Amino acid sequence: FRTTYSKMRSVPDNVPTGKHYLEMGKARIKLEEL
RNA sequence: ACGAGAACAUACGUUCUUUGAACCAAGCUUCAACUCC
């Protein structure tokens, strides 16, 4: 596509009233045995 | 006017009996439905 400068962009989401701008995919991890 | 003249090497008889093309062997391995507007 078109050529711009560094950096390009990131990708948050939108949900209203007001958009909250959360980043997609980030999660939490717990490991317990058996 | 022959050590000659006649005279079937012939008759009967299952290449047959017993026997697993078997045995052991993961269609599996690494693999983001993602990327950019």
Side-chain angles (χ1 to χ4, degrees):
Chain A
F1 68 108
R2 60 155 172 163
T3 60
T4 63
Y5 42 84
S6 173
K7 57 164 198 303
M8 81 205 168
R9 270 198 210 72
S10 78
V11 63
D13 71 329
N14 277 332
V15 64
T17 305
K19 277 74 69 177
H20 302 329
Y21 294 81
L22 282 72
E23 305 89 30
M24 312 265 298
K26 56 199 302 179
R28 302 293 178 90
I29 279 167
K30 315 175 172 58
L31 271 75
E32 306 94 350
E33 313 291 332
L34 277 172

Coordinates of all heavy atoms in Angstrom, one line a residue, chain A residues 1-11, chain B residues 35-37:
Chain A
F1 N 0.9 -1.2 0.0 CA 0.0 0.0 0.0 C 0.9 1.2 0.0 O 2.1 1.2 -0.4 CB -1.0 -0.1 1.2 CG -0.4 0.1 2.5 CD1 -0.5 1.3 3.3 CD2 0.3 -1.0 3.1 CE1 0.0 1.4 4.5 CE2 0.9 -0.8 4.4 CZ 0.7 0.3 5.1
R2 N 0.3 2.4 0.4 CA 1.0 3.7 0.4 C 2.2 3.7 1.4 O 2.1 2.9 2.4 CB 0.1 4.8 0.7 CG -0.7 4.7 2.1 CD -1.1 6.0 2.6 NE -1.9 5.9 3.8 CZ -2.1 7.0 4.6 NH1 -1.6 8.1 4.4 NH2 -2.9 6.8 5.7
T3 N 3.2 4.5 1.2 CA 4.4 4.5 2.0 C 4.4 5.7 3.0 O 4.3 6.8 2.5 CB 5.6 4.5 1.2 OG1 5.6 5.6 0.3 CG2 5.7 3.2 0.3
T4 N 4.5 5.4 4.3 CA 4.5 6.5 5.3 C 5.8 6.3 6.1 O 6.7 5.5 5.7 CB 3.2 6.5 6.2 OG1 3.2 5.2 6.9 CG2 2.0 6.6 5.3
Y5 N 5.8 7.0 7.2 CA 7.0 7.0 8.1 C 6.8 6.0 9.3 O 5.8 5.3 9.4 CB 7.1 8.4 8.7 CG 5.8 9.1 9.1 CD1 5.2 8.8 10.4 CD2 5.1 9.9 8.2 CE1 4.0 9.4 10.7 CE2 3.9 10.5 8.6 CZ 3.4 10.3 9.8 OH 2.2 10.9 10.2
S6 N 7.9 5.8 10.1 CA 7.8 5.0 11.2 C 7.3 5.7 12.4 O 7.6 6.9 12.7 CB 9.3 4.5 11.5 OG 9.3 3.8 12.8
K7 N 6.4 5.1 13.2 CA 5.9 3.7 13.0 C 4.7 3.8 12.1 O 4.2 4.9 11.8 CB 5.6 3.1 14.3 CG 4.6 3.9 15.1 CD 3.9 3.1 16.2 CE 2.6 3.8 16.7 NZ 2.9 5.2 17.1
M8 N 4.1 2.6 11.7 CA 2.9 2.7 10.9 C 1.7 3.0 11.7 O 1.1 4.1 11.6 CB 2.8 1.4 10.0 CG 2.3 0.1 10.5 SD 2.8 -1.4 9.6 CE 2.2 -2.6 10.8
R9 N 1.3 2.1 12.6 CA 0.0 2.1 13.3 C 0.0 0.9 14.3 O 0.7 -0.1 14.1 CB -1.2 2.0 12.4 CG -1.8 3.3 11.9 CD -3.2 3.2 11.4 NE -3.5 4.2 10.3 CZ -3.0 4.2 9.1 NH1 -2.2 3.3 8.7 NH2 -3.4 5.2 8.3
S10 N -1.0 0.9 15.3 CA -1.3 -0.3 16.0 C -2.8 -0.6 15.8 O -3.5 0.1 14.9 CB -1.1 0.0 17.5 OG -2.0 0.8 18.1
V11 N -3.4 -1.5 16.5 CA -4.8 -1.8 16.4 C -5.5 -2.1 17.7 O -5.5 -3.2 18.3 CB -5.0 -3.0 15.3 CG1 -4.3 -4.3 15.7 CG2 -6.4 -3.2 15.0
Chain B
rU35 P -3.1 -11.2 11.9 OP1 -2.5 -10.7 13.1 OP2 -4.6 -11.2 11.6 O5' -2.4 -10.6 10.6 C5' -1.1 -10.7 10.4 C4' -0.7 -10.4 8.9 O4' -1.4 -11.4 8.1 C3' -1.2 -9.1 8.4 O3' -0.4 -8.0 8.7 C2' -1.3 -9.4 6.9 O2' 0.0 -9.3 6.3 C1' -1.8 -10.8 6.8 N1 -3.2 -10.9 6.7 C2 -3.7 -11.0 5.4 O2 -3.0 -10.9 4.4 N3 -5.1 -11.1 5.3 C4 -6.0 -11.2 6.3 O4 -7.2 -11.3 6.0 C5 -5.4 -11.2 7.6 C6 -4.1 -11.1 7.8
rC36 P -1.1 -6.8 9.6 OP1 -0.1 -6.4 10.7 OP2 -2.4 -7.2 10.0 O5' -1.2 -5.6 8.6 C5' 0.0 -5.2 7.8 C4' -0.4 -4.9 6.4 O4' -1.0 -6.1 5.8 C3' -1.5 -3.8 6.2 O3' -1.0 -2.5 6.4 C2' -2.1 -4.1 4.9 O2' -1.2 -3.7 3.8 C1' -2.1 -5.7 4.9 N1 -3.4 -6.2 5.3 C2 -4.4 -6.4 4.4 O2 -4.2 -6.1 3.2 N3 -5.6 -6.9 4.7 C4 -5.8 -7.3 6.0 N4 -7.0 -7.8 6.3 C5 -4.8 -7.1 7.0 C6 -3.6 -6.6 6.6
rC37 P -1.7 -1.5 7.5 OP1 -0.8 -0.3 7.7 OP2 -2.0 -2.4 8.6 O5' -3.1 -1.1 6.8 C5' -3.2 0.2 6.2 C4' -3.6 0.0 4.7 O4' -3.8 -1.4 4.4 C3' -5.0 0.7 4.4 O3' -4.8 2.1 4.2 C2' -5.4 -0.1 3.1 O2' -4.7 0.4 2.0 C1' -4.9 -1.5 3.5 N1 -5.9 -2.4 4.1 C2 -7.0 -2.9 3.3 O2 -7.2 -2.6 2.1 N3 -8.0 -3.7 3.9 C4 -7.8 -4.0 5.2 N4 -8.7 -4.8 5.8 C5 -6.7 -3.5 6.0 C6 -5.8 -2.7 5.4

